[PDB]
Write a protein that binds this ligand. Structure first.
Ligand SMILES: [Fe+2]
Ligand SMILES: [Fe+2]
Lengths: 513, 514
């Protein structure tokens, strides 16, 4: 039966907070594993208005950097606003100065509210633009702004770079690479070398994917990577670059005003040979969905297995994530989601070898899937997915795996945040082979993306903990806590309670100390 | 885990048998329910060659009519070949005379009624998918009469899957040449037997007509959906090239299979008609390509139609995989042959009845209990995505059956099915279509038939009753075949009625209470 939230406590995920001057010791219930040593670092919006000027969209609030430190079974909590140009100019001018995703200012945003990742010995907070912000992972101080356009030919880059075990970083962004035309560029940033010079200054374009519309790139949030292949999924959510420059020059546009849906193209999937740095011209096609998060991608005989969190439909899912809608009472929140895209976890299987002798047949000869790929006479390969998880307006989202050991490789387990009509209200584990699921949830508690940490000496895939930040507003209750679950079955091992609210956070990482 | 059949006992499903002169008494184990009083009547092929001339395809063998009678806890088995023209002329001439689905006769439409049996008024008719249906005596299994549906209504053929309403009304669908220069599909209605006692077939009429996606190529239609207020028809990319049968059957000899092709670009078109106002509804429902043979059930839920289907993903015709030489191969080869086939999947589609243009670009499926979507586009098409109910690698839930008398056309919870393992029937299944919970019955080296549901007379719940299935079980010191009775609640075994003779594949049938 449908879990309801009449108390409306999720509204606290979208309430402005104050930063801390120094770390705060959390109150620990249960027992934190003595092997867990390091820092959970997470990004999200923390300031949702400047004076009496509101930010309107979920992705507009000013970037706040959060840290839970684990040492010898003890936990501290800390947070500092990132000193972006967006933030600094707002504090100076006492108004909204820089246009954000869904809020026009009355200059491209560097508001780094989305994620944080390592480059070399350094860490960068990011959003999805050309500006990334160097931050100190120890003190949470802001170090510098870096403009990716100084180094490589991209207009922006996702908040979901892939990082290989040696430190190499891959990312994607749109560009004008091709003559007369839009393209998508894979950027690679090397590991730090003996010369010790900034790896960002050695950035390069590895390969370029073509675009389905000369003048309209698709919105890209993440992408797939394996040892030999790069997978890029081109959705029907398009950026109409004509609509901004028109309004930026004529009348008051934000980033959300530039999006449109292409109703006829469906989804085009694309692969590139990572090592030979070569696009492969296989025209993979399927029906329309939005995609934000790839789960994992791997090679199996000569197929790519592509596990995705999908939303069925071509309407942009971000239309449903304005703060006024997310702050509404529960009955209204559910009503608002009634015509939304339906979330579904899907496995697609892409054949690498296309034999014309098989035209009109299913090419997916693997024994352990129901995914199909049909070779048509016009050379397109039409894909049908294997559904791994699907519940009515209950999304398995913000997925995470044992990335260090299983990213890009055959795997069994994913962890995610369960969204109930867009409200984060449970944690999920999914076996992608058997479709078995496990769930943690408590009434009136709204958790964040779960981050997996392996026991250091683990040989198994799910031998470790998942960490999640939980908001638990009520009479009597501590307003928030860090939750530590056993990764085997999502049973609770400990929690670390704080006496202050913590707003929504999107992404982060655990930094082993 | 993967179930293997290295002994190859499934080959006995496709082996010829002799009819019986009178019913055999079957050997009972367990307990036959004492409220089960009636006959299980099923059809299938029983003669797979005529002398030295083979039939090639699964749907070519000559129709055999089977009967298990239940009374006071005891069981009899009987079988007689149906005396169709195809059979009678093959016996007379000692050769294949009538071209079958996948077999050309060498030196005239088939009435080889191997597929199903159903009631019209006080009569029973065996059928295939052509214009010819065969009246049979359900007590003696004697053949009574050939009936040509073209004498009565303008269809070219009619499915082996009519819907029968509680009062006896029969609805069926078939292609026709209706509109000026145009193929269409006609819904035929056969009324209940009236006070006249006049033959209901002489009162048959066309209810409504669906348009065809292609002026000259109708799609293959195997079944359709029916609710109290609506008729639902699914137009798949499997097309019949009418140019091609009249063209190729004159050169040397084509069969029916030779006429099929697959349309690569249309996907699937779904269609609805208002049943009571007898009107086509012009909503252009569209989705991705699949083969469809069996609807499971259909019902109305607020302003939506819930359409549950057994699908095969892809546009290649599934029947290409059902030639007898391939089904008789050893198990490793049977598996290899199914590698590139369409993947089976049970899908629930949800069709909005009310389309508002202010919702253009959005999902119209506002129901609380489904992940199915229907997106209204600018060109007015409605693009559907299904909710997947069951999906296993080359493991189909097929030959679906429900508690039809009480739940057909209505909200429902349970379906029963035959599980196909790379096209080999090797288990029985039950599916809760709401929770997606399944139950399975299987035994090594046992190959069952479509399960048919019979309700307990005092039934309170939808699944209060039994399912009956005919099972082939060849092997050292085993009875070669048996009637299986399972409890419909949990598919636990209730009884078997064993026989000492082989029983080949049967496709469909019914339970006639008495
Ligand atoms: Fe993300
Ligand atoms: Fe059938």
């Amino acid at each position: 039966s449908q879990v309801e939230h009449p108390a409306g406590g999720y509204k606290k995920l979208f309430e402005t907070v104050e930063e801390l001057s120094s770390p705060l010791t959390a109150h620990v219930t249960g027992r934190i594993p003595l092997w867990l040593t390091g820092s959970l670092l997470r990004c999200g919006p923390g300031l949702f208005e400047v004076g009496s000027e509101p930010f309107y969209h979920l992705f507009d609030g000013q970037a706040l950097l959060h840290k839970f430190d684990f040492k010898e079974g003890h936990v501290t909590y800390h947070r500092r606003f990132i000193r972006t140009d967006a933030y600094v100019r707002a504090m100076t001018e006492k108004r909204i100065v820089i246009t954000e995703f869904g809020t026009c200012a009355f200059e491209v945003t560097d508001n780094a509210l989305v994620n944080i990742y390592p480059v070399g010995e350094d860490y960068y907070a990011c959003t999805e633009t050309n500006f990334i912000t160097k931050v100190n992972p120890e003190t949470l101080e802001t170090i510098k702004q870096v403009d990716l356009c100084n180094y490589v030919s991209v207009n922006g880059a996702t908040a979901h770079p892939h990082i290989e075990n040696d430190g190499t970083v891959y990312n994607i962004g749109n560009c004008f690479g091709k003559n007369f035309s839009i393209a998508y560029n894979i950027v690679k940033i090397p590991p730090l070398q003996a010369d010790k010079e900034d790896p960002i200054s050695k950035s390069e374009i590895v390969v370029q994917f073509p675009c389905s519309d000369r003048f309209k790139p698709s919105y890209v949030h993440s992408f797939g990577l394996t040892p030999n292949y790069i997978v890029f999924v081109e959705t029907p959510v398009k950026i109409n670059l004509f609509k901004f420059l028109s309004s930026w020059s004529l009348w008051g546009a934000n980033y959300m005003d530039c999006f449109e849906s292409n109703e006829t193209m469906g989804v085009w999937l694309h692969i590139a040979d990572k090592k030979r740095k070569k696009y492969i011209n296989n025209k993979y096609r399927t029906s329309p969905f939005n995609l934000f998060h790839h789960i994992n991608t791997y090679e199996d005989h000569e197929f790519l297995i592509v596990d995705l969190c999908c939303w069925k439909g071509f309407e942009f899912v971000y239309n449903y994530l304005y703060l006024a809608n997310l702050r509404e009472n529960w009955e209204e929140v559910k009503k608002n989601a009634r015509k939304a895209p339906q979330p579904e976890v899907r496995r697609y299987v892409l054949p690498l070898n296309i034999d014309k002798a098989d035209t009109g047949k299913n090419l997916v000869t693997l024994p352990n899937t129901t995914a199909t790929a049909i070779l048509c006479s016009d050379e397109t390969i039409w894909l049908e997915p294997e559904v791994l998880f699907s519940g009515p307006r209950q999304a398995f989202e913000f997925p995470q795996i044992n990335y260090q050991k299983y990213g890009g490789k055959p795997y069994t387990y994913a962890y995610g945040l369960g969204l109930n009509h867009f409200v984060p209200d449970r944690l999920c584990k999914l076996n992608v082979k058997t479709k078995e699921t496990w769930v943690w949830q408590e009434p009136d508690s709204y958790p964040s993306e779960p981050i997996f940490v392996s026991h250091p000496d683990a040989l198994e895939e799910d031998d470790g903990v998942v960490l999640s930040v939980v908001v638990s507003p009520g009479a009597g209750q501590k307003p928030a806590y860090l939750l530590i679950l056993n990764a085997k079955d999502l049973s609770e091992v400990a929690r670390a309670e704080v006496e202050i609210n913590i707003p929504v956070t999107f992404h982060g990482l655990f930094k082993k100390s």
